[PDB]
Amino acid sequence: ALKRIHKELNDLARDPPAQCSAGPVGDDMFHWQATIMGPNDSPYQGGVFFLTIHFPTDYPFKPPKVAFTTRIYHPNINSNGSICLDILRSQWSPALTISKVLLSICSLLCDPNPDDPLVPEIARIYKTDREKYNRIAREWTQKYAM
Amino acid sequence: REVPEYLNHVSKRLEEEGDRVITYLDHSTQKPLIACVEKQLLGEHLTAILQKGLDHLLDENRVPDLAQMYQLFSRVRGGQQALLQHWSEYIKTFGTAIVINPEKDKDMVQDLLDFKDKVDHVIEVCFQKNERFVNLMKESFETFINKRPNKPAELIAKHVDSKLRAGNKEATDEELERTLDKIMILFRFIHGKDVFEAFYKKDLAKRLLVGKSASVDAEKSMLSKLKHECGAAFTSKLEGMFKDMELSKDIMVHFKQHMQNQSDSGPIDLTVNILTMGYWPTYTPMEVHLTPEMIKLQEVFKAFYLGKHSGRKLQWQTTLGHAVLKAEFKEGKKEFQVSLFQTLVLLMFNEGDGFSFEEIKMATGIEDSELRRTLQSLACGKARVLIKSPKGKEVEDGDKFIFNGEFKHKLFRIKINQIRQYQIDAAIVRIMKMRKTLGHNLLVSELYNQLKFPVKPGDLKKRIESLIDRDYMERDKDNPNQYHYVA
Amino acid sequence: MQIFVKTLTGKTITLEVEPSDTIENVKAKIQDKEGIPPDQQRLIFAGKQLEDGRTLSDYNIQKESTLHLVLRLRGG
Amino acid sequence: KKRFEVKKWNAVALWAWDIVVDNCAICRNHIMDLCIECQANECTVAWGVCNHAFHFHCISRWLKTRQVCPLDNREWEFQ
């Protein structure tokens, strides 16, 4: 529904989340662009990763197709910039609003789960050697996020 | 010669030299001559001229001389820049005189509005609307208005209340909005704007609940500026008040019909405003010994309103109400629009011509401090409906107030209610980027010079350690005191 | 002291907490405030999971701060 | 001689909710205010055993998509 998206947009403009920002890209309110500043105390510090939200025609009862536009290093995010959250495919809940899905993604930037990973190649590096992970993620952030 | 005459002398001389060139000197000598004379007349005395004349001249609002001054100073290289300073510093010097002195509170805003209009006028006429001077006019006002925390906002808020009040019949509709527009250009410069709302909201709360607003169209005009100036979030709570007044009248239509359908309608003609508790100023409920006919009227309404909207609760504000008490004096009947406290206390002065301060108190239950204020309104006011024994301005516990049956007043209806963490981080990388190599000691020194807040040594070191971790800065291989720029 | 938390339903509620308090009790306070089970909360501060076996003082949380509440998720 | 009588009266009264607005999560409306779909023109509020409030017109559709409360993960039944 639009009215749900309208209310989300207004209540986000008034009281924005701290390190998040999302608004329509143009005339079509169903196509937002968001932005997840890299959480502090993480390899993504100082980064600004742009998402691309797409709300379906029944948005309250059906998840939005969010997908990173800035190539992010993450076991749970493929090089194409697609996420695989369980909340976003299987356990979508209408009570969860865009200000919340963006914040949950921001939290998951620091809390991956290499078990059942969308990118096993990075998942193996993360599981085995976390020291190298925090450097490869840092260089990807510096070469894409800044 | 004084500066105002001296500028005329310089204006004369330049044109003579300008006239000489056309007369007999070759045109190729036009420029070096003018610059030569111009350098000596003004270029060597820019500070001397400005100090002697500008500060005096600006106060007198001498339009022509300033126009001559700005016109002349533009010729010198850096002359105009020298004029911005002594003009800018004049604002911060004379401006502070308006705000710093607390003894000038009653005449604060009008000076700020007047002094604002004056400097703007100088920009429009003399300085040829120079955009650079416009900015430093805005930037300068922002500074000195904020040298007094939270008081200019209060006075601007109090000022707008006076303009909008029903007592402000003198300023017509067109005149008023122009005054507000000048205020909004002044309200922008304040920093503690969140303090302006509470002072303007509390005043606006009084305006609606006593119907003293001069022009409803002027009210809605005001918020249309704040909403455009600070967004709907800033003015969200304000607009809720207007809805409540709008919604309350609708409730009165439905409620009044209910009493008409009932054959038992009290002589008391009733109106009650229903206001969303979240928006309005916080009021402390306080109990009063209402009469048996008085207590019923809320009960029918409270049940009625609740019956029409479940989940609500109407907790009353006896303080903000006001009733009418037609009186039977010895020289004609009079009406008294009186608050509930005045209503109850004045309902203690008929059976007995007088009662003690304490005799009334347990009868009604008002707080002593406010009961005294109420009684003062009934004895010491212009409409002396009581005779205080002993007579005086202030009320005492031993007072046996006596009802004034000899009350005389011109009007028939009368009123008595008159009574830093990232900042450190950003600077460190910024400074070190330029340097490309630096020690700890200088890096520490320039921070306080470049940071306008205290910096603890422990906090300062922690950021340095954090920046080392993120590869922003690197220590020397052998000198921990010495850092190097990495990227 | 107290702390602000932004529940899922758009509302905001204030929690009376101490820095020594552990996150498990924080989630229990969220529960008896509105009632989503201790397991399903996932408190977020600066985009960080608030681990159950820790206390606010661990995460550098002070007065008038804000904690964000979401629904429990997982990787993929 | 003795006359305790009142002839008119105006007052005010602040209204507050019994417990809380109970913000619907599906539609983000106010409980007395109708469902977001129902505004476009009898929209009742239906409780879950969680005590969670939802407009019937919202929670019915969500149930038609999922027999799960959106806030809590328990199942949906009224009282």
Add this chain to the structure above:
Amino acid sequence: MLIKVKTLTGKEIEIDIEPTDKVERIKERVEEKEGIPPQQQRLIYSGKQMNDEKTAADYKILGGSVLHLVLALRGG
């Protein structure tokens, strides 16, 4: 109008601008009230990195429209 430029920490810096100011003006105003020179800002409004030549009216910035500020430590 007022734009409140809230950074990561949650501090909500107030700013004032005319409807036609170029965003370089916005960054300069942030410099005065916060101290970060315009080279090291990256203002993000509603998920669009503002570009240093666009006028504020381009983005439909209104009263009380919150921006976001993120530090670019390099910042040229």
